[PDB]
Symmetry: C4
Subunit: 389 residues, 4 copies
Amino acid sequence: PTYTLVWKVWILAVTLYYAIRIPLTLVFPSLFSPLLPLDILASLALIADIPLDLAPSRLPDLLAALPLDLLVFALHLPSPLSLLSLVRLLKLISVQRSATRILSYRINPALLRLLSLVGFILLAAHGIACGWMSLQPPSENPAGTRYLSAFYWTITTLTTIGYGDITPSTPTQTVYTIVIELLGAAMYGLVIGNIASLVSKLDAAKLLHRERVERVTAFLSYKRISPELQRRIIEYFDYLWETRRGYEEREVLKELPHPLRLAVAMEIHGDVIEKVALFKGAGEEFIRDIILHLEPVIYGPGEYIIRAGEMGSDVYFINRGSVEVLSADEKTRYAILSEGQFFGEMALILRAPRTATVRARAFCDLYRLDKETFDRILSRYPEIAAQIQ
Amino acid sequence: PTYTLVWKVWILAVTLYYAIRIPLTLVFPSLFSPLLPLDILASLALIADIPLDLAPSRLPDLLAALPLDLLVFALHLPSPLSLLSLVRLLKLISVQRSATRILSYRINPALLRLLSLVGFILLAAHGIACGWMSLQPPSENPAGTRYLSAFYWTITTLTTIGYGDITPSTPTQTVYTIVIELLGAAMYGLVIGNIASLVSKLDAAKLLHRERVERVTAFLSYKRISPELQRRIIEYFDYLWETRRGYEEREVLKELPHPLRLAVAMEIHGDVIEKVALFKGAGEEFIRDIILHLEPVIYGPGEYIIRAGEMGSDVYFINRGSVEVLSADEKTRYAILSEGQFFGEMALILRAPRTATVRARAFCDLYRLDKETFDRILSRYPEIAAQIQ
Amino acid sequence: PTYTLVWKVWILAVTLYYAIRIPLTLVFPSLFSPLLPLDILASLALIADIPLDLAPSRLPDLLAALPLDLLVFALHLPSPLSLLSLVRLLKLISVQRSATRILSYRINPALLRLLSLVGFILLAAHGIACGWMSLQPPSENPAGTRYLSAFYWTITTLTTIGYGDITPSTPTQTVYTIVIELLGAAMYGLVIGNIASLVSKLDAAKLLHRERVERVTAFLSYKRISPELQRRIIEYFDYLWETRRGYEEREVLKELPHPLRLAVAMEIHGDVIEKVALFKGAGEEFIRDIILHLEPVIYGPGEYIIRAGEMGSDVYFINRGSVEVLSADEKTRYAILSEGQFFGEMALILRAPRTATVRARAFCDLYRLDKETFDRILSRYPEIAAQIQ
Amino acid sequence: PTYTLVWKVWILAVTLYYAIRIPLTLVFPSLFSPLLPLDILASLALIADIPLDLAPSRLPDLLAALPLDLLVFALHLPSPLSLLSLVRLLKLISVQRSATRILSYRINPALLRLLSLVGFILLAAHGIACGWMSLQPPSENPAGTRYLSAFYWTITTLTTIGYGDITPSTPTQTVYTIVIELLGAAMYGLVIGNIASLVSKLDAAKLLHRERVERVTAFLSYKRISPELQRRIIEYFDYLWETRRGYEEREVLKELPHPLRLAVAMEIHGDVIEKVALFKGAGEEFIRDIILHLEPVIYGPGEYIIRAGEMGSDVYFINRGSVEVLSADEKTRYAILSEGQFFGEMALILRAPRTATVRARAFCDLYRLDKETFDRILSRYPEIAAQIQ
Ligand SMILES: Nc1ncnc2c1ncn2[C@@H]1O[C@@H]2COP(=O)(O)O[C@H]2[C@H]1O
Ligand SMILES: Nc1ncnc2c1ncn2[C@@H]1O[C@@H]2COP(=O)(O)O[C@H]2[C@H]1O
Ligand SMILES: Nc1ncnc2c1ncn2[C@@H]1O[C@@H]2COP(=O)(O)O[C@H]2[C@H]1O
Ligand SMILES: Nc1ncnc2c1ncn2[C@@H]1O[C@@H]2COP(=O)(O)O[C@H]2[C@H]1O
């Protein structure tokens, strides 16, 4: 549903309202004007979200729900006790722990952590500036100019810049300053770390592939291999990057279980299926057993697949590329094949050698049957086995 | 035991006492008041821990135990020789090397390194501030205000902020300042590095899973596959994340040896065990041989497991989900199965085709027997083999 | 082709011209002198590149092509509206997205990202300094001295140094300063992250190898193994690092498909091929079947390969190193073999035990046949099988 | 040899002398006193190392050898031309590229890179401070106090601290300052990156093991397994960490080739070898064939290995731990076995069931024979096969 979503958003806005008012009031008690209605509404939202959640871990919600702030603000309390209203916070923890699940997949987790941290940083800067322009000699100056200098200071401190135009004078100012410096250096170490971890995973494939190619190459040069083969290999890896980004079909489809892998394979070879069982008569238990045995392979341009005098024994189904057939030795082409078709069948149904030569024309992406396996699951079905003659 | 633990804690507190007194005294010799008893107790603790340890590597303990400080403090020594009392340190090395083993597993090692580094940082700041408010023109000012400005300075320096409100005047001040700047830039590089390494390993599974899904998807789109199958795959991966966090059963149980793997499997299928060998009569050497051959598999909602005209030859044991049985083609359901039950048995004990259809209702988590293996270890036990008829 | 390349370079230079003039003019309207021709040429280049691209994603090109700047500059517009000329930017996005593909392989992607980021940084510094020396009390000072102080300021800010020699005075200055501080701390976090990710992948092999050796060693010492064997192992790993950088032949050649792997293997063992089939008569279907079964192995100096009383049954082809033959027990050497040669043949074609002993002399890199496989694919070809007698 | 080593060290010291004198002279021409002998010696060392190297890449050595500095220093040259003496540098590149190989293995490569970078940093700081105290109004002040302030400045700049006590006044000063700021921010990004990469690889095993345990656990809890088995598993992983640091024997010994693996295995089971072939009569071709088939396994305390009514068919050799034998059901122990011994033999040489029960007493580390393999390579040797009766 969405009501829980909009509700959590309302809780977020409420805790923001509190995080921003609480301290600004502790400094400027001239607020708490006929503006308590919003405080009451927010307290009600929190005390009405604590049960929903029920529909250690719940300790923050309990500490945030009770109005430990309305008292201190209504009945004037002194400086060291006027604090403890911040207990109305600690709901930000629940907010983060909720929105890290509501939005746990659609975006990188590191990015989400980074944004949360930045929000936390800015709220803390707002609180720290309030604390600073509290620890200052009282003067007659507008509250919009006392708050600007404080934000300027705490941002030059948290940022590790430190101009030096406005500095501590009294000791307590100095202790506050020390603590803020440490939190800034500790708040600036987290940002950099999250960012580094976020960029160290952007270009993964374009690094894995690069390392794999470097490995292959650096290994071949030790074997003192010709540059032509090196160039063929490099072209192969380029073609394998600019289509599927470097991934191998088998290792991938192995990450899936049997039914989904079968459905994939049956959505791939569907065309071939409507080009084989036409005059055969089988189906639904034979097509589904070989299809998991088809192993892929890629033949570059000009590479020989089948020669006119061998006994390969296998059969090849094309999926993407093209192919040309030729005579044994006179480079005369019978025809040209393309996707969907198939060849290598005779030497399977029949134990004769090959009758022609097969040379590719461009980068193929075809599949093949070992025939030890294909002939093994044919014997098991004797009807088609008789159909082959 | 715990006596060694509390003892190491006492040694830690003692070396802390020394790290904090040693320099503060070197600056303020007005200490060394009738406060030597604590120094004697700590020297005794160190000289009494050096033998326990015995119950290069031991060089620091030897240099820390001898009272090279009590002399210098008792018999007044000049400024360049009043040093060398810090030899009482170097016990922090033993402390770190001990507590990195006492607490080596219950918490992340990087976190522990980070906390140790921060403690080392603060102690060094305390020492550096002492050194600074030594290298200052002598004046009549309280010692609590001379120590605050020094800590403020060295924290603005180590932090890489550098306001500029208090700076070096004399040359030796300037050399001290240079060294502190370098140590700060070298002390601030370690913190950031530890933090980055600590956040680069929080969300591991939620990154491995994400990359695996991106790979699968980006590979399928190249094969021009329908979006329905893509959605089924995504739902599968979601269900596989929100239960076991992305981990595969086989790859995991493979990280264990044979006895623990067997005990696991026998705690899992225990229910099935009390639903099979009832009227059989076997046990303790047959149940324990098949159980290691049960391979898991997951069938999504609506996926066909068994059809009314095939010869699957296998048998399926359910563990978590549910299932429905149906006729061949008229979508009439005989009954509904749930966890603990089993089906697919007839075509195993008997070589007939299937008699019905089996379609899942929700995400199953079931197990299956190949039957090549099951029928192979049945033949080996001829008694049950006759029991099957 | 190259015309598209030089064209994209021209587009890059044009968008640079704009990024550098646009703001410098907004500050110094005394420009827009008889210097509009270059602006017209650049607008034409952009409006003429938008169609080529055609030969969301295209939104930036559309916003950059229309002359939303020529109006504002021709007809004088006020300060808050004189902006929006920067819409002529956003072409840098297309520039980056184009040059990240044009140069996606020849250099590390991280390095490219880093250089792009640095360029973006410097352009932003140029814009920010213009913005700063706009938000300054008007004075009579040369424009080359007002622009230097601004660049100095924004570089001391973006860099997180913050001397403090020139600072904000007015509030709007202060808000600008806050924003620049945040962007600097956010612009300095990206640089460090990219750099860390760029150095964390330089020494990969020299780290993988090191870890593998540490693992092997630390495992052996637990088994209380002699140091001699440890030294032999270390020498082996050194020799395996200083030739092929730690990579194993099989795992590597497995990253290739069958045809390229076959061509590799046939370029390697080519010499052996012209030393075997001389008096045999086979070829093109037997040489090509065993060659994929040759498994490599490395024998250190002094290691026994074959002893005079065993029945190894295998045959060894040498590729790089040398070897010595010897009698059974009297250390008398018959001859010495080197690369290209072969031995171990008799016990293959004949089922007698070995006749001599074979000890290496230096680090060999040889290959061997199991003979279960070699004798299996020989039977399949009965002609040579009769040729062996 | 070592002469080349000491020679490279001399070259290093010479290029250091030059890097430190060259600029300090360019600033203080009052040097070049009767101190030219050292310059001549260093030029000779460089011009005499250029040929040794011979016993693009050599361009730096050629540019460093010719005395492009002795002229400028002898015949007074003006300020913009008095430069180009730094060409005597660029030998540091050869120094780094040499010492990165001389010391490429004994220490982590990242540490070495870091130290090189730090040295480069300090030399650059020395040069930059010279350049700075050149770009200063000439005054009457000692050269040891003009050089201290410059080093202080450039270290507060390179470090990203920036106090602000001494700043640029003139424009050229300001441009120098800008460049130094960028180099510092670019010199401080490299240090942090190297450090992060150096700490991200310290605790590898103690992280891999931790992740593996988290995976196993988090997977079991989903299967709702008892806590007793969980505790047994945790104890197993602890014992497996505190002996061999988490590494598996098979995966490790698989990183070695056949001869070294054989020699390892024959140094391990050597005791067993002198406890088996005593009354047998075999050797050197039977012991060496089974030893590679022994598979390891670990049985925790109290785990049953063999029960008095099964037909395990296998045999177990102990290596480290202990074991107890017992009757079928009355917990009466016949004897107690320890390392070196063996059991499970009868049911191998004979096809009877087991005669007793075997329960471990502590963490064992034993090995076992499948017996399908052991009985297969026994048949091949018929002599011992008759010896078994
Ligand atoms: N004229 C042709 N046009 C297209 N394909 C052919 C032609 N002649 C033979 N082939 C195919 O090429 C294959 C090569 O030899 P096979 O015996 O494997 O079976 C052959 C046929 O499938
Ligand atoms: N009426 C039924 N209720 C539940 N399960 C059934 C029913 N009829 C058949 N089955 C099971 O469904 C299986 C499908 O075909 P099998 O031959 O494998 O064996 C069958 C039985 O185990
Ligand atoms: N005199 C020799 N010179 C070179 N190689 C030899 C000599 N005698 C035997 N060999 C080879 O050494 C091999 C060792 O025993 P094989 O039976 O395997 O076959 C033997 C021959 O190939
Ligand atoms: N009394 C004994 N003391 C020690 N080992 C024994 C004793 N009796 C039997 N065993 C061993 O325990 C083994 C258990 O059954 P096996 O048939 O495998 O062979 C047995 C012997 O090797």
